[PDB]
Structures are given as structure tokens and as C-alpha cells.
Design a protein around this ligand. Structure first.
Ligand SMILES: CCCCCCCCCCCCCCCCCC(=O)OC[C@H](COP(=O)(O)OCCN)OC(=O)CCCCCCCCCCCCCCCCC
Ligand SMILES: NC(=O)C1=CN([C@@H]2O[C@H](COP(=O)(O)OP(=O)(O)OC[C@H]3O[C@@H](n4cnc5c(N)ncnc54)[C@H](OP(=O)(O)O)[C@@H]3O)[C@@H](O)[C@H]2O)C=CC1
Ligand SMILES: CCCCCCCCCCC[C@H](O)CC(=O)SCCNC(=O)CCNC(=O)[C@H](O)C(C)(C)COP(=O)(O)O
Ligand SMILES: COC1=C(OC)C(=O)C(CC=C(C)C)=C(C)C1=O
Ligand code: SF4
Ligand code: SF4
Lengths: 157, 114, 75, 384, 198, 340, 174
């Protein structure tokens, strides 16, 4: 087909496939939910298998997984690093301590959620969110990206 | 009464330190604004410093004044060495908060308890 | 020797929270100007920058007189 | 010495604003910053009942999830002058040790990842994984179990766990052996680790190191042999003391306690008694659900225990165990109320970090990375 | 019932007198808890002297400081109760020396006696506000850089007075007075019936 | 229909303003949602941009304060459901470029008229319509002339609908200030009439936003056509140089006939991806600011304007070279004010 | 009982042995052999969507509210599940239903606040609130994570068959 609509959608998809197949994460590793992510990186549940690299610096990172309490002192940093990433960037909040406040919600030093400091795309629940659950959450980010249609909106704009 | 002394036996011996800190803070403001690239005036910053020092102008007890500058000196050491960042400094210059009125009409109109 | 007074007078009026044409050498920062204790501190500091010499913590306490400041700066 | 604010994502557990002044590649002074993970754990506990503060301890240093719980347990048991039942004690030593392995696999393999060796981590994280499964099939959670409660364990082991904690133990050794063939004698591990961060014996006691860090310097102190807690007295193990204390020697010590813990686990499987896993005082331990659903005194005791609490007698105690990192102690001051008054958690780690300055002197940037590893710093315990 | 070993209760009691005699000054209310634990209590001025004797005495070597903490009894005139827990590797024993300090009456620092205290003393200042003279470098260890108020004081609100969010207008994180969306439900738990003390 | 305002005034509090805001993704918009969210108002943000782009708005709103509904301008039904449950409708729908599928008249006049018609049907208490300052049906730039046609129509679809009419806006991410500063790439910075006789009065974005928000919560404004203007006027010359001044980049004002220049705008306009300059822009830029004769805006609506020099440092800092970024505004020289 | 982890003649045989170790990197080659060995071992990873890591009956996972077979919801609003929740997550307000029975008008578990301790599972007398097996409930928006009675009751109905099997397996232990 040559209708430019079918010409575009297809192109967008390719773009989405590339970003969704290779997501390079970065793990601030606040707290413990970091241990449950290292497990994902580990052999039972290989993250790489999916195209997720075990480690990445902020410049080269597609997704930031905030694992653990985002305390008030670390809150300015989180932002900095979120602000130091590329134009196509995403945030997967991991842990009840970062989805909301978690056990430490009423504390004076804990931000009640990272979505008060960085926009969050997928919220993975559980105190130590199971590694399979993170993997489920990373896979749902992949379905979120697949649906994104950036060029078709350009074309229809 | 009958209280052991922390730093100054008497207030006139403590004001001294208060001033010295005042000197130190005075000079610091300019450097901070530049290093932390803040959106504030050198004079503006120096104004805030004045505000703070004066806020606690009422304290009459020597011991309280001494610990206040103990706290004050650590404050500028973190302000210097850029341990505090722009976000921790600009907070002094409160922003994004609707100053709450103190006029009774204002309190009566908005807010159940004054 | 007067040149010091010439510079000292220039510094006092420039801050502009003092000496609105009431600047006098005998005038005392605390005694008649009413400038605050702290403000004086600012003043002495000011004088230090223009003079290029930083006066100690204490002697600032003794001089509230521009003329006396010129007295000390000359020393 | 241009401050590099070296730190946060660095090579630490997320938070180390390790501000450092370095003349080129030499470290002149290290001033670690802490509190990037302060969360209020000590103040929050004052507003919670004893049983609802147990989950906080698992989060204090969560690599060592349970061993921490044992310290609060012991502490609350002392204040009540109640002691667990015999089977529960062995359990706590069984899962106490399994947890030590879990911590050492974390400490040795994460140490290497920062050094640059990445294959040991994947090799042993698979073994870790298998252990987590023990936790899950005993507690319900992979980590953050809440299994060791103040009066014993929560629920007896599933019918079949012991057998599997055997198959694993029967083999884990080879897995430690492998790591060895990759790092113990690597012509290169030794270099980056040997003679780095040597700590004298007198200085280690002075800075309150109290852990492998002391044991590595040759001081012989294992709170588990010196002041036995639970039934660690009935087992037989050898403390792995070290000489020429340095990053390499202490490492060897951590690999050796992984080995000695398998000796303690074996015994616990060989000699765990038939019995109950929680004190029979409905006063301290919650009544069994069949009992609370058929007996009035049990419902009343279930209702009061869950809603209000233990009501510990007024007193204060400092009880310290040998958590994998080092001496983990809870100073729990308690009024007669059901909720504690103070609970300072002594973290093996607040003392160790402090030593970073006195250990990493005249050292290169890479040396600092090696020393943070040889202290097993989990910022949860330090920040609390 | 815990397996108390009276053998201990006695030996530690005997040491408690030993210390009380050795330092009649600065030491009062020495008592061995029913938990086989000793807790010499010293006048705040005896901080340096009592510790040093325990760190360097042949019959009582207490080399490492397990912990330095400060309970806060608001009722007590001297609000804080600095507690130092010390361990004897040689004698396999532990002891507690606890002093009292009010908010603006500082305690001496023992960084000299044990350098372990360099950090814990900073921790006590940050949380409770007690000040330690002669400390090498007192400065917040756990609280935020700009934090105002000492958090573990019983008179400090749990949630605190300030919380942080990112504001676009100013493109920077910004404190605001705390506004909580579900206040901490303060369950009253004390029962109006006591337990006849054994 | 209302929501008693309870709370202390910050996030997690309630103000009772449920408001559809169709063009929130915009530079002005971003700010409008900021205050509305800060105040605690219920904000419904219609969007046709992809979800990734709308993310920046999520964090300033409290939990449940912001609702994002999809919407298409050509499809009348989308506007219908957006205003179903709103009681305040704010229209910020404009684009300075004329895109292939939406012609200047359609975005400025057709889309607002339909939106205003919908809320009269819905029963929204008040509608705020935003049109550019100095806009007359026989003016120079089509954009402005059209916008002028628009303010009229919407009055008939929605009577007593407030019509704030802002000047070109000064703010980070604005064009007025960044555009000129970005002339750096161009070796020479063309300025019609060598940047003279087109005195301009900028207005900080926030001032505009706060003003707009205050409108939503004030009975005094009905049928009012406020004009947020600014705290000081300027001949385009000082503005241009000043900008280059803070940016610390050389300035070469070069005279170039607007005749030929309208052609340069045509050139960029030709470009497919968001033309940087617009024929309609060019005219606008050299379209002199009109003296305030309409309803007073800022101050009148409760916010004291903020001088340009005060916040300019923040807007132009990124335009600056690596060096000179620590240069601050008070050591630099503030340009003179020409009221003319 | 203690042990010395690293506590310690020069003969040509010895030296030549040691020199060869430094010169031809003998121990380094030893390390390469170990990794080559595993390259030949079967990888332990699982196809995550197709094959799932095993979780036994006590796995806490996601909260659900059960119902009596008859169809009457088990919860009788005693509200001690609220009392023992460590995080303050569960909010319960109740009123007598017209039937005269006692039921919860609003039961809201804030899952972002919840730290999945499993005490609520423990505390309930009728065992109405249970830790359900599902761990995969990641949500695009924060609001979805907050759960009211209808979501939990719906969660309970969906997973009741497995929840019943799981409670069946572990109740003797409790
Ligand atoms: C008549 C006869 C005339 C000739 C006489 C000849 C006499 C016999 C030959 C003598 C020299 C033999 C060895 C030459 C190469 C090795 C040189 C050497 O000494 O290696 C340097 C280093 C030593 O190790 P280190 O402990 O750091 O140093 C101790 C002393 N300071 O070693 C290292 O650090 C090595 C680090 C290696 C890291 C990567 C290892 C990769 C190993 C696998 C690949 C091995 C090479 C494969 C080559 C394939 C073909 C090209
Ligand atoms: N900044 C300026 O130059 C000034 C602007 N104004 C007025 O204020 C209003 C806001 O200004 P500003 O924020 O700069 O404008 P923007 O260029 O930022 O655009 C405003 C919004 O309009 C939306 N929009 C544009 N075209 C369409 C369309 N065809 N259908 C649906 N939505 C559309 C855009 O959404 P999206 O991009 O997602 O499609 C955008 O979010 C404008 O309408 C303008 O008339 C007044 C004075 C100065
Ligand atoms: C912009 C940069 C931000 C820097 C802000 C700064 O760090 C924070 C700050 O100043 S913290 C202020 C606390 N500073 C005191 O508390 C001193 C109190 N000093 C006394 O009370 C005297 O003893 C006396 C009785 C004479 C006062 O009398 P007087 O009226 O001043 O004269
Ligand atoms: C030994 O310390 C470290 C951690 O704790 C184990 C981390 O979580 C992290 C975070 C990295 C991941 C992959 C979670 C780093 C970098 C680290 O150095
Ligand atoms: S959520 Fe549970 S696990 Fe993740 S950080 Fe908070 S506590 Fe540790
Ligand atoms: S405990 Fe079980 S029954 Fe009682 S309220 Fe909580 S859930 Fe409903």
C-alpha cells in the first residue's frame, strides 16, 4: 500500500519495536528492592534475555527503575539523574516504598512516592516486588511502548 | 538560674561571635550565588541573611545564643563546599507557597482555624 | 591623611541605608545614625574592601566614628 | 585535592555521597555522607506495637533479612523473660545461617562486580535464588519474611523443606569452590585486594568495628561463641580468624564462614527436635486459629494480641547477635506499654563506614571501591 | 522462663561495686538489671573519667563502644539520657554507662576515649540536639542538609513539618508545609487494666 | 453544583474548580495547570499529543486532581464529553504556524467556537478564551486578524465569556525571548527598521497564568477583555541586544526590508517540521505593541507584573556559552525602557 | 574453636614452579577453564511468560476479600485487620446493613502503602482478607493501585478457587 497512513504506521511500529526490544535500564538501587532486581539480572530470570542490559549509565539509559525509599535528601538527585537521560526516557517505580511511601510513608524524611519527583510510567507493587513481578512490569512497559504512535500523530498534526 | 555556660559567660561576650558569623555569612553570599548559579541578588541574599539573624534577635540567654551560632556555622559550612545544592539554598528564599495572610478578614474568609 | 576620610565618606553614603546627607565624621553609626549593630558590621566590612585591609573582629567594636576609622586605617 | 563528590549511581548501595578530595588519582581524605536512606525506622517504631514493628527489622539490613529479626526477637523475649520453644530455636539457627550464606554471597559477589569480575555474581545469585525459595516456602515472602517473631517462629516448616535445605547444602559447597577457582588465587584479585585497607587489631576494637573486620585483623571474637544466643551453643563451628588483615584476608574469612555455616546448617537438619514453634503463653504468642475459633479464652487472647499488644514489662536491654555483617544490637527501652519507647538499632556498618577514612588513606580511586566492598555496607542499617 | 545464670548476676554486681568504689565521684545508682546487665549511672561530668577507667583498667578492659544513644524522657528535667553500651572482649562482658543531659547543657565527647563515638555523637546531635564539646566535627549525619529541628525528640511530629515535591514553574524541588492525604491514625492502645506486678 | 473549598491551600487540598483546559500541553498551558493543580482544583486536560509528551503535567497535579481525556478538534463528540463534568472551560488553542490539516482560521476561530458552544450546552459557569494582544480584523498578520474574528464569534456561542488578550509572552520555553536569543546560529540578526518603532511589552508567563487562574475564581470578571501586558515596554532594539547581552553573544543588528524578510519567513514556513519563523510571525514581531486601553489585566486581576530583567537570567541561561553561565544579571547592564 | 584462613624453602623445583606460575600465567588459565566448563552447562533461566518461577501456598502476593460459599462476603468489619496493619494501609468504616448484620461500607487497601507483611491474613477471625497468589498486578496509574471493596471483592471472586486451595493446604500449619 502507498496511502501514507499505511506507510507511516508501519514506520512507527519499527521505531517502537527498536525501543521496546532494547531497553537499557539504570538502577538507582535505593533500599532493598534493588536486591530483588539483581535477581532479575541473575540467571533464573535473565533480564538480558529480553534485551534489558544488566547495567547502564544515565546517558545511555532508556528506563530508570526506582527501587527503594526515595528519601528527602536523595530526592534532588533522583531528579537530576532523570533529567540527565535522553529524550525517549521512562520510569518504572518498583516497591511499595517508591510507588507510594510504603511502611515509611508517614516518616519525615521519606518522599511519599517517586511520582512526586519523577513522572512514573509503570508502578510495580510489593514490598520486595517479586523479580518475576518486576519482569512483568518491564514487559508491560514494553506493551506501553508498542502502543505509542508518535509519527502518526505527527502526520495527523 | 545558676546555669553552666556553653560558650559565653555573658551576652556581650557572645554577641561577639554572633557578629563574627555575621561577617562570615556576609562575605559568603556572593560566592554562593555564583557557584550555585542561583536566581537571586547578591544584595537579596545578604538581605535574607539579615532577616535570619534578626529573627532570633529576641534571645536574651547567653547559652541559647551560643548553640544558635553553633548551628549557624555548620549551616554555612554545608552552604560552602556546595554540600547544600541550589534546591537546599533557594528553600530559604521560600517560593511556591502562598504567603498566608494574617489579617483577620483574610483568615476568616479562608481556613477554618486561625 | 584626609584622602582616607575622602574614601571613608564615599563608602558610608554608597550603601544607601545610612547617611542621607546626614553623614558627618563625628557622627557615630550606633550613637546618632541609629544604623543597627549588624549594619555597622556591614559598614566596617565595606571599608575593608575599599581600603584593601581587613580590620579585626574587635576593633570594629570600638570605631563607630568615620573619623576614628580613618584614624585606625592610617595606622 | 579537588572534591569529586564521587558517588550517587556509583558502586555503593545507591547512596554514598562520598565526597572526596583527590590529588590526581590519590585520595587525601574521604568524608562519607550518610542519610541518603534515612527513613525514620527508629521513630516510626515508637508509634507501633511490638509485633507491627517486627517487619521494620527485616528492612533495616535486608540482605540479611532474618538474622536481624532474631535480634529484635531475642530482645523482646528478654524483656518478657520468655524464651522460645526448642524447635523454634533450631529453626532460627537454621534460617539464621542460611541467611549468613545469603549475605556472604551478596558481599563476595557484589565486591567482585565493583572490582570488575561479573561471572561470580551470576553463578551464586542462582544459588541465592534457590535459597530465597526456602524463605518463601517457609514464610511466604522471598525476602522480608517476618517469620522470626518475638516468641519463636510464626509457623512450622512446611512438610518437606528440611529435605531440600539438604539437597542444596549438599551441593552448595562445590559452588563456593568454583568461585574460588575464579577469585581466591586469581593473579589479579589478589593484587587489587591484598594489602588494601589493612586495619590494626587495636584500631579495629577502638573504632568499634565488631565483625569480620575485627576477626580479619586476628582478634578472636564471635558473639556466637563468646555469648551464645538461641542454640548456637549446641552446634560446633570454627570461627575463621585471619592474619595480615587486608581486603583479601577478610574475604577469605567470609568464604570460610560460608563454609562453616554449611557445617552448622547440616547439624541443624540432623538434630532439630519435634515440638512447637511458638511459646505456649497466649499472653505473648498468638493463639492457634483452630483454638481461637473454638475457645473463648483464645479469641480474647487473639483479639487483644493483634489489636493492642504484648504489654512488655518496663525495662531496657541491649541484645546483640552476630548478624552476617557484624554485631547487630537493639537497645529497646520499654515502658509497660504495648508499643516500645526507644529502639536504637546498632548497625554493624555505622562503625565500619566511619573507618573508611582511617582505612583508605593515600589510596587510589579504585582502592576506595574495593574498601566499601570489604565492609559489606548496606545503607539501610547505617541510615536507619 | 529465660535460663538465668545467677553466677553472672553476682559477678557483675560485684564489679558494679568495684567501679562504684574506684570512682566514688561521678557514679551513682549502680544497678545490675534482672537481665544480667550492669548499668552504672554517672554524673555528666564523669563521662570522660568513667569511660577512660573502663577502657584502660586491667581488671575492667572495655575496649569497644557498642553504641551511644539518647532516650528522651520529656518529663525528666534533664531531657536526654545518653546511654553508652561497652563490651569487654577479654572478660566476655558488657556494661552500660548512662548520663543525663538537658537540651542546652552539653556533654563532653569521648571521641578521645573511643573513636567509634565520632559518628554516633554526630547522630545524637542530629536526632536529639545534645551537643558534645571537643568533638572533632559535629555535623548532621542522618537528616537532610537544610533540615530544621531534631527529629527523634518526643516533641517532634512524626510526619514532620516539611515535605518535598518537584514544581515545574520553578523547575526545582521545593519544600512546602506537610499536607498528608490520610493522617496517621493514632490508635489508642493502652488498656485501663494493669497487670499485678508479679 | 459546587465544591466547598476545604484545606490549607496547598496540594492535597480542595478549591472546587473543575476545569477543562483543551490546549494545556502548551507553554502557557503548562503554567495554567501548575497553579490550578497547586490550588487543588479539579483539572481535565484534553490531549491529542502522545501520552509520553503529556507525562510532564502528571506530577504537579495531586492524586486524582488531573484527568487526561483524548480529543480531536474535527470530532465534535470529543469536546462534548470533556466539558460534560467541568464547570470552568479555559481555551488556549493556537499555533503560530499554519499546519497542513489545520488552517489558521480553523485553530484560532473554528475550534474555539465549537468548544464554547459545547459548554453553553454543558452548562459550564464560565469560559475563558485567550486571543493575542493588539488583534484587529484588518490588522497586518492573519493570525492576529483571525484571532480577532474569533473573540467575536465565541461571544455569540458563549455570552459573558471572559476574553483575556495577552501580549507576546516572556517565559522559559517562550518564543519571544528564546527566538531572538537563538539568532546566534545566524551570524547576523536581521531586525526590521534595525529593530526600531515596534516597541514591545513582554509579560512573564506566570503572571499571565496566575491572572488566568484568578479569573476562574472571581466573579468580577464576566465579559471582561483583560489585557495582561507587563511591567515595562521596550524598543525591539534593546530587547534584542539585551537578550544577546545575557546570552553573552555578539550583536549585529542588520536592517533588512520587511518586504524581503516576509520572504525569509516564507522560507522557513515552507519547512515541514515546525517552521522556526513564520511569515505571520515576522509581521507580528514588527507589529508594534498597542498601548493598554482595554480592561486592565495583571494587578487588576490580582498579580503584580514581574519585570523582564528579573527572570531573564533563567530563560536565557541555556542560550549562553559554557563560560559566562555564572555571569549573573546585576553585574550585567539592564537595558533602557522606552515607553513611546 | 578458631581457624587461620591465611596464616603462613626456596628450591629450584619450588622456584622454577613459582616462576612458571608468574611467567606463563598458569593460574589465570585455570580460571578460564572454569568458565568454559559452565558454557557447556544447561542455562537455568525460565521463559518468563511461558514458564513461571515456583511459588508455594503461603506466597502473599495480592490482597483479596473472600466470600462465604453461599455468597455473603466474609468480612464482618471487626476492623482489627486495620488495627494490626503496620503501614496504616487498610481503611475501614462500617454501618449495620439493613439485614441488621454488620458489614463494611468502605474497605480500602492502599497497596502502595501496603508492604505485604501478611499479618492481615493472620489477624482476620473470619479470614475474610487473604493474601492471594497473584503477584502480577502492575498498573499504569497510581490511582489503580489504591483498591476499594469492589476491586478486592472482584479480586476475591476471580482467584477464590486457588485461594481456597492455598488456604486448604496451609491451615493445619496455622
Ligand atoms: C633460547 C631461548 C630464547 C628465548 C627465551 C624465552 C624464555 C621463555 C619465555 C620467557 C617469557 C615467557 C612469558 C612471556 C609473557 C609473560 C610475561 C609476564 O611476566 O607477564 C606479566 C604478568 C606477570 O604477573 P604479575 O604477578 O602481575 O607479575 C609478577 C612479577 N611482577 O602476567 C600477567 O599479568 C598476565 C595478565 C593477563 C590478563 C589476560 C590473560 C589472558 C590469558 C589467556 C590468553 C593467553 C595468551 C593467548 C595467546 C594466543 C596466541 C596469540
Ligand atoms: N506564546 C505566545 O506566542 C503567545 C500566545 N498567546 C495565545 O495563548 C495561547 C497559548 O499559547 P502557547 O501555549 O504559546 O501556544 P502553543 O504553541 O504552546 O500551543 C498551545 C496548545 O494548542 C494546542 N493545539 C494547537 N493546534 C491544535 C489543533 N489543531 N487541535 C488541537 N489542539 C491544538 C497545542 O497542543 P499540541 O501541540 O499537543 O497539538 C498546544 O498544547 C495561544 O492560543 C495564543 O493564541 C498569546 C500571547 C503570546
Ligand atoms: C542566601 C544565603 C542563605 C544563608 C542563610 C543563613 O545560612 C541562615 C542564617 O542566617 S541563621 C540565623 C541565626 N542567627 C542567630 O540566631 C544569631 C542570634 N544572635 C543574637 O541573638 C545576639 O545574641 C543578640 C541578642 C545580640 C541579637 O541582638 P540584635 O538585635 O541582632 O542586635
Ligand atoms: C555492593 O553494592 C551495590 C548494591 O548493593 C548490592 C546495588 O544495589 C547497586 C545498584 C546496582 C544494581 C544492578 C541494583 C550497586 C551499583 C552497588 O555497588
Ligand atoms: S518497598 Fe519493601 S522492599 Fe522495596 S524498599 Fe520499601 S521496603 Fe525495601
Ligand atoms: S479482619 Fe477480616 S473480617 Fe475483621 S475486618 Fe479486617 S477483614 Fe473484615
Amino acid at each position: 500500500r502507498s496511502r501514507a497512513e499505511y506507510v507511516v504506521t508501519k514506520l512507527d511500529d519499527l521505531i517502537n519495536w527498536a525501543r521496546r526490544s532494547s531497553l537499557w535500564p539504570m538502577t538507582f538501587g535505593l533500599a532493598c528492592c534493588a536486591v530483588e532486581m539483581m535477581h532479575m539480572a541473575a540467571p533464573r530470570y535473565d533480564m538480558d534475555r529480553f534485551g534489558v542490559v544488566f547495567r547502564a549509565s544515565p546517558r545511555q539509559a532508556d528506563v530508570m527503575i526506582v527501587a527503594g525509599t526515595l528519601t528527602n535528601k536523595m530526592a534532588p538527585a533522583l531528579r537530576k539523574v532523570y533529567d540527565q537521560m535522553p529524550e525517549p526516557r521512562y520510569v518504572v517505580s518498583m516497591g511499595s516504598c517508591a510507588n507510594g511511601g510504603g511502611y515509611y510513608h508517614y516518616s519525615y524524611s521519606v518522599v511519599r512516592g517517586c511520582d512526586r519527583i519523577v513522572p512514573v510510567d509503570i508502578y510495580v507493587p510489593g514490598c520486595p516486588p517479586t523479580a518475576e513481578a518486576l519482569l512483568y512490569g518491564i514487559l508491560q512497559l514494553q506493551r506501553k511502548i508498542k502502543r505509542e504512535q508518535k509519527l502518526k500523530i505527527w502526520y495527523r498534526r | 538560674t545558676s546555669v553552666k555556660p556553653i560558650f559565653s559567660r555573658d551576652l556581650n561576650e557572645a554577641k561577639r561571635r554572633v557578629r563574627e558569623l555575621y561577617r562570615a555569612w556576609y562575605r559568603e553570599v556572593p560566592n554562593t550565588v555564583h557557584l550555585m548559579q542561583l536566581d537571586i541578588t547578591v544584595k537579596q541574599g545578604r538581605d535574607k541573611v539579615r532577616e535570619m539573624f534578626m529573627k532570633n534577635a529576641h534571645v536574651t540567654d547567653p547559652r541559647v545564643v551560643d548553640l544558635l551560632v553553633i548551628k549557624g556555622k555548620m549551616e554555612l559550612q554545608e552552604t560552602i563546599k556546595v554540600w547544600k545544592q541550589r534546591t537546599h539554598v533557594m528553600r530559604f528564599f521560600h517560593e511556591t507557597e502562598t504567603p498566608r495572610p494574617k489579617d483577620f478578614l483574610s483568615k476568616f474568609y479562608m481556613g477554618h482555624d486561625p | 591623611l584626609d584622602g582616607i576620610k575622602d574614601r571613608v565618606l564615599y563608602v558610608l553614603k554608597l550603601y544607601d541605608k545610612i547617611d542621607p546627607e546626614k553623614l558627618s565624621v563625628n557622627s557615630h553609626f550606633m550613637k546618632d545614625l541609629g544604623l543597627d549593630s549588624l549594619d555597622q558590621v556591614e559598614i566596617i566590612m565595606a571599608m575593608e574592601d575599599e581600603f584593601g585591609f581587613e580590620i579585626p573582629d574587635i576593633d570594629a567594636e570600638k570605631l563607630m566614628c568615620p573619623q576614628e576609622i580613618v584614624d585606625y586605617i592610617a595606622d | 585535592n579537588m572534591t569529586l563528590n564521587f558517588g550517587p549511581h556509583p558502586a555503593a548501595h545507591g547512596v554514598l555521597r562520598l565526597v572526596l578530595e583527590l590529588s590526581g588519582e590519590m585520595v587525601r581524605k574521604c568524608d562519607p555522607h550518610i542519610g541518603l536512606l534515612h527513613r525514620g525506622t527508629e521513630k516510626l517504631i515508637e508509634y507501633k506495637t511490638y509485633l507491627q514493628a517486627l517487619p521494620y527489622f527485616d528492612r533495616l539490613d535486608y540482605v540479611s533479612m532474618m538474622c536481624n529479626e532474631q535480634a529484635y526477637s531475642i530482645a523482646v523475649e528478654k524483656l518478657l523473660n520468655i524464651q522460645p520453644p526448642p524447635r523454634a530455636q533450631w529453626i532460627r539457627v537454621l534460617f539464621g545461617e542460611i541467611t549468613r550464606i545469603l549475605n556472604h554471597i551478596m558481599a563476595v559477589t557484589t565486591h567482585a562486580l565493583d572490582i570488575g569480575a561479573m561471572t561470580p555474581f551470576f553463578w551464586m545469585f542462582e544459588e541465592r535464588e534457590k535459597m530465597f525459595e526456602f524463605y518463601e516456602r517457609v514464610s511466604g515472602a522471598r525476602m522480608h519474611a517476618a517469620y522470626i517473631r518475638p516468641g519463636g517462629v510464626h509457623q512450622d516448616l512446611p512438610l518437606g523443606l528440611l529435605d531440600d535445605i539438604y539437597e542444596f547444602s549438599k551441593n552448595f559447597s562445590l559452588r563456593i569452590d568454583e568461585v574460588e577457582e575464579m577469585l581466591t588465587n586469581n593473579r589479579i584479585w589478589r593484587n587489587r585486594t591484598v594489602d588494601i585497607g589493612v586495619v590494626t587489631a587495636e584500631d579495629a576494637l577502638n573504632y568499634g568495628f565488631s565483625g569480620v573486620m575485627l576477626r580479619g585483623s586476628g582478634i578472636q571474637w564471635d558473639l556466637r561463641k563468646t555469648q551464645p544466643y538461641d542454640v548456637y551453643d549446641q552446634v560446633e563451628f570454627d570461627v575463621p580468624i585471619g592474619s595480615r588483615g587486608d581486603c583479601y584476608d577478610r574475604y577469605l574469612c567470609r568464604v570460610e564462614e560460608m563454609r562453616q555455616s554449611l557445617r552448622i546448617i547440616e547439624q541443624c537438619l540432623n538434630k532439630m527436635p519435634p515440638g512447637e514453634i511458638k511459646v505456649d503463653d497466649a499472653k505473648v504468642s498468638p493463639p492457634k486459629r483452630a483454638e481461637m475459633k473454638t475457645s473463648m479464652e483464645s479469641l480474647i487472647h487473639h483479639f487483644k494480641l493483634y489489636t493492642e499488644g504484648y504489654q512488655v514489662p518496663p525495662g531496657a536491654t541491649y541484645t546483640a547477635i552476630e548478624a552476617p555483617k557484624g554485631e547487630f544490637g537493639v537497645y529497646l527501652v520499654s515502658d509497660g506499654s504495648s508499643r516500645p519507647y526507644r529502639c536504637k538499632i546498632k548497625a554493624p556498618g555505622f562503625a565500619h563506614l566511619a573507618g573508611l577514612d582511617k582505612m583508605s588513606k593515600g589510596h587510589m580511586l579504585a582502592d576506595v571501591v574495593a574498601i566499601i566492598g570489604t565492609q559489606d555496607i548496606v545503607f539501610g542499617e547505617i541510615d536507619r | 522462663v529465660r535460663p538465668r545464670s545467677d553466677v553472672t548476676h553476682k559477678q557483675l554486681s560485684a564489679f558494679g561495686e568495684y567501679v562504684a568504689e574506684i570512682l566514688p565521684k561521678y557514679v551513682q545508682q549502680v544497678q545490675v538489671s534482672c537481665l544480667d546487665e550492669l548499668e552504672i549511672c554517672i554524673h555528666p561530668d564523669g563521662v570522660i573519667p568513667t569511660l577512660t577507667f573502663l577502657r584502660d583498667h586491667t581488671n575492667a578492659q572495655f575496649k569497644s563502644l557498642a553504641d551511644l544513644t539518647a532516650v528522651d524522657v520529656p518529663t525528666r528535667q534533664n531531657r536526654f539520657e545518653i546511654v553508652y553500651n561497652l563490651l569487654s572482649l577479654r572478660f566476655n562482658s558488657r556494661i552500660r554507662v548512662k548520663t543525663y543531659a538537658d537540651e542546652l547543657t552539653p556533654i563532653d565527647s569521648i571521641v578521645s576515649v573511643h573513636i567509634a563515638a565520632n559518628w554516633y555523637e554526630r547522630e545524637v546531635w542530629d536526632m536529639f540536639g545534645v551537643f558534645f564539646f571537643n568533638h572533632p566535627d559535629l555535623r548532621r549525619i542522618l537528616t537532610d542538609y537544610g533540615f530544621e529541628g531534631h527529629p527523634f525528640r518526643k516533641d517532634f511530629p512524626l510526619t514532620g513539618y516539611v515535605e518535598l515535591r518537584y514544581d515545574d514553574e520553578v523547575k526545582r524541588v521545593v519544600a512546602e508545609p506537610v499536607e498528608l492525604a490520610q493522617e496517621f491514625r493514632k490508635f489508642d492502645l493502652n488498656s485501663p487494666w494493669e497487670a499485678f506486678p508479679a | 453544583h459546587a465544591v466547598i473549598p476545604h484545606g490549607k491551600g496547598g496540594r492535597s487540598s480542595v478549591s472546587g474548580v473543575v476545569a477543562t483546559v483543551f490546549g494545556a500541553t502548551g507553554f502557557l498551558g503548562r503554567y495554567v495547570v501548575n497553579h490550578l493543580g497547586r490550588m487543588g482544583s479539579q483539572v481535565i486536560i484534553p490531549y491529542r499529543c502522545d501520552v509520553y509528551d503529556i507525562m510532564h503535567l502528571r506530577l504537579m497535579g495531586d492524586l486524582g486532581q488531573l484527568t487526561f481525556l483524548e480529543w480531536d478538534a474535527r470530532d465534535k463528540d470529543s469536546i462534548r464529553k470533556a466539558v460534560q463534568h467541568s464547570n470552568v472551560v479555559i481555551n488556549l488553542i493556537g499555533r503560530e504556524w499554519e499546519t497542513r490539516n489545520f488552517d489558521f482560521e480553523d485553530v484560532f476561530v473554528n475550534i474555539p467556537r465549537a468548544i464554547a458552544q459545547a459548554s453553553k450546552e454543558a452548562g459550564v459557569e464560565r469560559f475563558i478564551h485567550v486571543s493575542h494582544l493588539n488583534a484587529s480584523m484588518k490588522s497586518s498578520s492573519k493570525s492576529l486578524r483571525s484571532k480577532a474574528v474569533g473573540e467575536k464569534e465565541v461571544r455569540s456561542v458563549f455570552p459573558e465569556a471572559i476574553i483575556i488578550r495577552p501580549s507576546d509572552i516572556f517565559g522559559r520555553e517562550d518564543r519571544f525571548l528564546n527566538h531572538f536569543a537563538n539568532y546566534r546560529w545566524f551570524l547576523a540578526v536581521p531586525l526590521v527598521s534595525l529593530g526600531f518603532k515596534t516597541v514591545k511589552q513582554p509579560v512573564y508567563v506566570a503572571d499571565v497564568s496566575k491572572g488566568i487562574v484568578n479569573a476562574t475564581k472571581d466573579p468580577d470578571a464576566v465579559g471582561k477583555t483583560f489585557a495582561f501586558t507587563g511591567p515595562n515596554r521596550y524598543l525591539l532594539f534593546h530587547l534584542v541586544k539585551y537578550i544577546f547581552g545575557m546570552t553573552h553573544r555578539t550583536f549585529i543588528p542588520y536592517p533588512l526590508p520587511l518586504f524581503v524578510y516576509s520572504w525569509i519567513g516564507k522560507l522557513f514556513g515552507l519547512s515541514p517540521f515546525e517552521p522556526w519563523t513564520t511569515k505571520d510571525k515576522v509581521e507580528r514581531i514588527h507589529i508594534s505593541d498597542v498601548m493598554p486601553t482595554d480592561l486592565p489585566g495583571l494587578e487588576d486581576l490580582g498579580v503584580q507584573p514581574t519585570p523582564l530583567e528579573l527572570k531573564s537570567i533563567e530563560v536565557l541561561r541555556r542560550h549562553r556559552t559554557y563560560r559566562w553561565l555564572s555571569s549573573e544579571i546585576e553585574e550585567t547592564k539592564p537595558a533602557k525602557t522606552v515607553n513611546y | 574453636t578458631y581457624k587461620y584462613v591465611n596464616k603462613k624453602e626456596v628450591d629450584m623445583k619450588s622456584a622454577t614452579d613459582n616462576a612458571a606460575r608468574i611467567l606463563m600465567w598458569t593460574e589465570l588459565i585455570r580460571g578460564l577453564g572454569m568458565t568454559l566448563s559452565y558454557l557447556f552447562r544447561e542455562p537455568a533461566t525460565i521463559n518468563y511468560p511461558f514458564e513461571k518461577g515456583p511459588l508455594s501456598p503461603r506466597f502473599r502476593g495480592e490482597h483479596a476479600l473472600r466470600r462465604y460459599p453461599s455468597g455473603e462476603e466474609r468480612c464482618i468489619a471487626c476492623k482489627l485487620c486495620e488495627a494490626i496493619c503496620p503501614a496504616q494501609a487498610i481503611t475501614i468504616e462500617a454501618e449495620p446493613r439493613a439485614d441488621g448484620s454488620r458489614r463494611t461500607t468502605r474497605y480500602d487497601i492502599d497497596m502502595t502503602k501496603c508492604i505485604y507483611c501478611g499479618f492481615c491474613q493472620e489477624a482476620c477471625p473470619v479470614d475474610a482478607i487473604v493474601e492471594g497468589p497473584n503477584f502480577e498486578f502492575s498498573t499504569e496509574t497510581h490511582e489503580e493501585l489504591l483498591y476499594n471493596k469492589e476491586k478486592l471483592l472482584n479480586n476475591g471472586d476471580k482467584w477464590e478457587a486457588e485461594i481456597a486451595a492455598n488456604i486448604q493446604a496451609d491451615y493445619l500449619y496455622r
